[PDB]
């Protein structure tokens, strides 16, 4: 996937 | 955002209904599943009721249609056509469209002209009272 | 750009004065807008100088010498601003070269519990304000939750691993000072299902896009329909996601039912027409027979018999026209029906291949928050999302331990000293500790102040590991109860050669059940040497703690072989497994906003404790017991930068208190 939610 | 993301549906009402109980979630989801079934049933039923009624209708009405003759409507009545008219007035009343078609060679207007010229001599009055009875 | 960049890089608005500043410069903020903009340039310019080179102590003499009038003018205001930035740790923090060697006339004594980053940051600051500081740690090393594994050239972080952007990150400063090597992270992460074959691309995106919506939907659910309590109990991000998915499933069915009910209403109309057409045909049939019978009376016939043909002939061409128009509006309804029976709505909300890829997206979320989504506050889980830094996240090729090790240089760190009892009173404090090696051996430390970097996990344990004398007051302990302490574990796989895609930083495994979305769900390379980290998250982290390292490394190679081949993946030379919840000096990973917590507990956790008076009728004592840590900093929790900032903060609070305000 994109590799988000690790803000 | 007053609007939920596009495509997702989240009614106040709907939220309360999927959380008024532990399982009220997946009872709401069963009682739809057990109705998507009960429509699909009554489709197949009416599909089959309908395809029976189609094979009961398998010739069109092609063997029953009457070839037609062009009819170039005339000024002069003739005693023949006068008599056809009085009988059609007895049968059809004021359906000037039918009384034209029956006779064969008279426009719908000539039928009115008649209806008023011979009103005296063909007691068209007396006749339409007899038609109104029927 | 320039003076403004330094404000933003110091987590400050260049535009206007903060609350910390209003408190210390009330003359100014309450005064005219002219004097405020001066204040603000001095502060921003002073910061700029610190940052432009933060290896050298920036003195008052230095900053004043590189202002220019009109700001240069007021040399008191400049000295106040410089001394404010000095305490609150906005300048001269981390590792500088002092220009004036700090005096050995040390004033005031402070015991700091734990060689945290929070611990060490505070220690270094209190020391540089000329206080006497001793640190007490249970472990045989500094760093705490910044634990790095070395064994030969293999080096891998079991603790903190990532620098979450340099854009306003105080660790941006520490990296210039310490010369730790920061590598970038490409966040692109291909997925691979249980079977061991890459989720195809159009899937990957359909599911991610749907995940991203499902979240946004909980946010609407929280803020818009105020769905944040349900049967006297706070709602979790978990509950809300289920209630959203249950409603997206319920809309799929409502949608089919609406469509079949529309087909049925058409078929019931085609039926009403066929019933009618079949009664007209069998009535035309009858009338035609009558017309042939009347037509077959051969002329010469009288006029009533002539009327009978001519009539019937009409009456039939009429009924033949009715049935021709009923048969045209039949052919409309059989197309309206081949239309609907060709354009259905969607069968399912999610397949099970889909609902499983979605579960990997929920593991990534469980991994970031270090807890099952069933525990995260719906209202508050994403509260710190405002203060996220800028730039790409970075690993520390060097190993993050190189930071606390560098921070330790020059401090009185007493290792293998487990604090057992903190006693605090009007007249000062005793900390009682023991040797973690031989535990009968007991140590007493006397001090004016105790600074407690004890992890929230430790603060939570019952029966308690550390006793407070007297007890921490309800308002504090209640917060420790309400707040959430999470869990997340790594598995370090050191191989001899690289058998994965060197230009891919990370990649994921999709588990077969929801119940194990977390089990070895993701794989990094440090990429320096051939090492693969494998993360355990969510309900899984907790359970995999009672499963031998050999079995975990088994499940790992199992998965890796699934993806890369069998003859591709050799046995590892060295493996390690984190078991953080089990580790008694941690009792877990890092804080999280539990359901029925807020950010406001983070603030309670930082408020120091003031003992009662010893003699009744005696001046209100000063505060004695202070708290720093990852769990005390509302806007930067569960990080290293948050720790480091929480320490810088308690240092200021304690100096303001014991050396009188700057
Ligand atoms: C697996 C994992 C990954 C992480 N990843 C990141 C990341 O990528 N980026 C990031 O920014 N943050 C990350 N964090 C968070 C970060 O590591 C910590 O929040 C940070 O190190 C906090 O330091 P602290 O000073 O609050 O506590 P700690 O570092 O835990 O220090 C507290 C100290 O207390 C000591 N101690 C405990 N009990 C006693 C006792 N009774 N007596 C004496 N000493 C005691 C401990 O030994 C320890 O030294 C991660 C955390 C974990 C667990």
Place of tokens 């933060």: C54
Q: Which helix (H) or strand (E) holds C433?
A: strand C428-435
Angle between helices C75-87 and C640-658 (to 10 degrees): 120
How many other C-beta atoms can be found within 10 angstroms of the C-beta atom of residue C612?
A: 11
Q: Is C167 left (phi over 0), alpha (psi -120 to 50) or beta?
A: beta
The C-alpha atoms of residue C546 and residue C539 are separated, in whole angstroms, by 13
Which residue, among C622, C634, C642, C655, has the nearest Cα to C84 in the 3D structure?
Answer: C655
Gap between the Cα atoms of C40 and C433, Å rounded: 46
| List of domains in chain B | 1-134 (1.20.58.1880)
Q: Are strands C412-414 and C625-627 parallel, antiparallel or unpaired?
A: unpaired
DSSP string, C120-189: HHHHHHHHHTT-EEEEE-SSSSS-TT--EEEETBEEEESS--EE--STT-THHHHHHHH---EEE-----
CA dist C133 and C126 (Å) reads: 7
Domain at C1-108: CATH architecture: Orthogonal Bundle (1.10)
Our answer on whether the CB atom of C175 is closer than 6 Å to any ligand 1 atom is: no
Ligand-binding site membership of C278 (annotated): no
SS3 for C187-222 is CCCCEECCCCCECCHHHHHHHHHHHHHHHHHHHHHH
Resolution (A): 3.1
Q: Please tell me which chains touch C, using 3 or more CB pairs under 8 Å as the contact test.
A: A, B
Contact C602, C482 (CB under 8 A): no
C368: nearest CA partner in chain A: A6
Q: What are phi and psi of C97, to 5 degrees?
A: -95, 115
Q: Which two tokens stand for residue C22?
A: 């209003």
Residues C92/C94/C98/C104 CA torsion (nearest 10 deg)? 110
Distance from CA of A6 to the nearest CA of C (A): 6
Ligand 1 atom closest to the CA of C631, numbered from 1: 26
Cα of C144 vs centre of ligand 1, distance in Å, is: 5
Residue pointed to by tokens 């700090």 = C102
**Cβ of C248 and B53 within 8 Å?**
no
> What residues contact C101, with CB distance under 8 A and at least 6 apart?
none
Instruction: Give the residue from C638, C356, C396 showing the smallest Cα distance to C533.
Output: C396
Using only C-alpha atoms, what is the Rg of chain C?
37
- Phi and psi of C306, rounded to 5°? -75, -40
Experimental method used, please?
Answer: X-ray
Burial of C349 (0-12, 13-18, 19+ CB in 10 A): middle
**Token code pair at residue C64:** 């004043």
Domain boundaries along the sequence of chain C: 1-108, 109-234+351-662, 235-350
Q: For residues B11 and B26, what is the distance between their CA atoms, to the nearest angstrom?
A: 17
The pair of three-digit structure tokens given for residue C46, joined into one six-digit string: 């002073």
Helix (H) / strand (E) containing C113: strand C109-113
The backbone torsions φ and ψ at residue C48, rounded to the nearest 5 degrees and listed phi first, read -55, -50
Chain A residues whose beta carbon lies within 8 Å of the beta carbon of residue C191: 1
C535 lines ligand 1 (CB under 6 A): no
* C245/C515 Cα distance (integer angstroms): 17
Angle, to 10 degrees, between the axis of helix C303-340 and the axis of helix B79-92? 50
- Provide the token pair at C114: 């734990």
Give the largest CA-CA distance in chain C: 149
**Rounded alpha-carbon distances, angstroms, from residue C264 to B9, B48, C233, C271:** 25, 12, 45, 10
- Give CA–CA dist C559/C574, Å, rounded: 18
Question: Contact at 8 Å (CB) between C530 and C496?
Answer: yes
Using CB atoms within 10 A of its CB, is residue C186 exposed (0-12), middle (13-18) or buried (19+)?
exposed
Q: Which residue has the tokens 């009173």?
A: C425
What 3-state class would DSSP assign to C80? helix
Residue C473: DSSP 8-state: P
Give residue C385's Cα distance to chain centre.
8
Residue C238 is given by DSSP the state: H
Going by CATH, does the domain composed of C235-350 fall within 1.10.287.80? yes
From the list C349, C330, C270, C268, the residue with the least C-alpha distance to B39 is C268
């Amino acid at each position: 996937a994109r590799x988000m939610q690790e803000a | 955002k007053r609007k939920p993301p596009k495509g997702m549906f989240l009614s106040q009402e709907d939220v309360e209904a999927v959380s008024a109980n532990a399982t009220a979630a997946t009872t709401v989801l069963r009682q739809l599943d057990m109705e998507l079934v009960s429509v699909k049933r009554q489709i197949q039923n009416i599909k089959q009721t309908n395809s029976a009624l189609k094979e009961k209708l398998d010739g069109g009405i092609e063997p029953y249609r009457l070839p037609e003759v062009i009819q170039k409507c005339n000024a002069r009545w003739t005693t023949e056509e006068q008599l056809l008219a009085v009988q059609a007035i007895r049968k059809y009343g004021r359906d000037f469209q039918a009384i034209s078609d029956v006779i064969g060679n008279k426009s719908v207007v000539q039928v009115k002209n008649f209806f008023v010229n011979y009103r005296r001599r063909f007691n068209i009055d007396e006749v339409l009272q007899e038609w109104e009875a029927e | 750009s320039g003076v403004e960049g330094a404000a933003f890089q110091s987590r400050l608005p260049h535009d206007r004065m903060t609350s910390q500043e209003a408190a210390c410069f009330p003359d100014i903020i309450s005064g005219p807008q002219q004097t405020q903009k001066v204040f603000l340039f001095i502060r921003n310019r002073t910061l700029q100088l610190w940052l432009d080179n933060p290896k050298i102590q920036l003195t008052f003499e230095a900053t004043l010498q590189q202002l220019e009038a009109p700001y240069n003018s007021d040399t008191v205001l400049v000295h106040r601003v410089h001394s404010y930035l000095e305490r609150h740790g906005l300048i001269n923090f981390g590792i500088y070269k002092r220009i004036k060697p700090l005096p050995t006339k040390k004033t005031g004594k402070v015991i700091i519990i734990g060689s945290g980053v929070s611990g060490l940051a505070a220690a270094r600051q209190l020391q540089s304000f000329g206080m006497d500081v001793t640190l007490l740690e249970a472990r045989d090393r500094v760093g705490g939750r910044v634990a790095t594994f070395r064994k030969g050239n293999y080096v891998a972080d079991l603790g903190a691993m990532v620098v979450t952007g340099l854009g306003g990150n105080p660790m941006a400063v520490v990296s210039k000072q310490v010369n730790m090597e920061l590598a970038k992270i490409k966040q692109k992460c291909p997925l691979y299902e249980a079977n061991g074959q890459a989720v195809p691309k159009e899937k990957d995106e359909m599911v991610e896009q749907e995940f991203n919506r499902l979240l946004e939907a909980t946010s609407y659910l929280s803020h818009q329909l105020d769905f944040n309590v349900l049967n006297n109990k706070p709602v979790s991000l978990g509950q809300a996601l289920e209630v959203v998915i249950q409603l997206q499933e319920k809309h799929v069915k409502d949608e089919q039912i609406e469509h079949w009910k529309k087909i049925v209403k058409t078929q019931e109309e085609l039926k009403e027409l066929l019933n009618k057409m079949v009664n007209l045909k069998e009535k035309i049939k009858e009338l035609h027979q009558q017309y042939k019978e009347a037509s077959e009376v051969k002329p010469p016939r009288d006029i009533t018999a002539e009327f009978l043909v001519k009539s019937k002939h009409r009456d039939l061409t009429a009924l033949c026209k009715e049935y021709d128009e009923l048969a045209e509006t039949q052919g409309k309804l059989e197309e309206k029906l081949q239309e609907l029976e060709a354009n259905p709505p969607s069968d399912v909300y999610l397949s099970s291949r889909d609902r499983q890829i979605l579960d990997w997206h929920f593991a990534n979320l469980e991994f970031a928050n270090a807890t099952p989504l069933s525990t995260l506050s719906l209202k508050h889980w994403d509260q710190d999302d405002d203060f996220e830094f800028t730039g790409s996240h970075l690993t520390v090729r060097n190993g993050y331990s190189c930071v606390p090790v560098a921070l330790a240089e020059g401090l009185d760190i007493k290792l293998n000293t487990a604090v057992r009892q903190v006693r605090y009173t009007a007249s000062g404090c005793e900390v009682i500790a023991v040797n973690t090696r031989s535990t009968s051996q007991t140590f007493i430390y006397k001090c004016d102040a105790v600074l407690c970097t004890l992890p929230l996990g430790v603060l939570k344990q019952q029966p308690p590991a550390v006793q407070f004398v007297p007890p921490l007051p309800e308002w504090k302990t209640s917060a420790v109860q309400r707040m959430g302490f999470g869990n997340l574990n790594k598995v370090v796989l050191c191989f001899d050669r690289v058998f994965w895609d060197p230009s891919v930083n990370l990649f994921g495994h999709v588990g077969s059940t929801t119940a194990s979305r977390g089990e070895l769900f993701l794989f990094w390379n440090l990429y320096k040497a051939p090492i693969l980290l494998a993360l355990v998250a969510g309900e899984a982290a907790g359970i995999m703690e009672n499963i031998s390292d050999d079995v975990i490394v088994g499940r790992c190679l199992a998965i890796l072989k699934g993806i890369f081949g069998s003859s591709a993946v050799p046995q590892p030379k060295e493996t390690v497994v984190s078991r953080w919840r089990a580790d008694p000096w941690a009792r877990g990973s890092y804080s999280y906003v539990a359901a029925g917590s807020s950010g406001n507990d983070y603030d309670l956790m930082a408020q120091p404790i003031t003992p009662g008076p010893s003699i009744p009728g005696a001046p209100q004592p000063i505060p004695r017991l202070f708290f720093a840590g990852e769990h005390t900093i509302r806007n930067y929790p569960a990080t290293v930068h948050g720790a480091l900032l929480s320490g810088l903060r308690e240092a200021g609070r304690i100096a303001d208190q014991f050396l009188g305000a700057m």
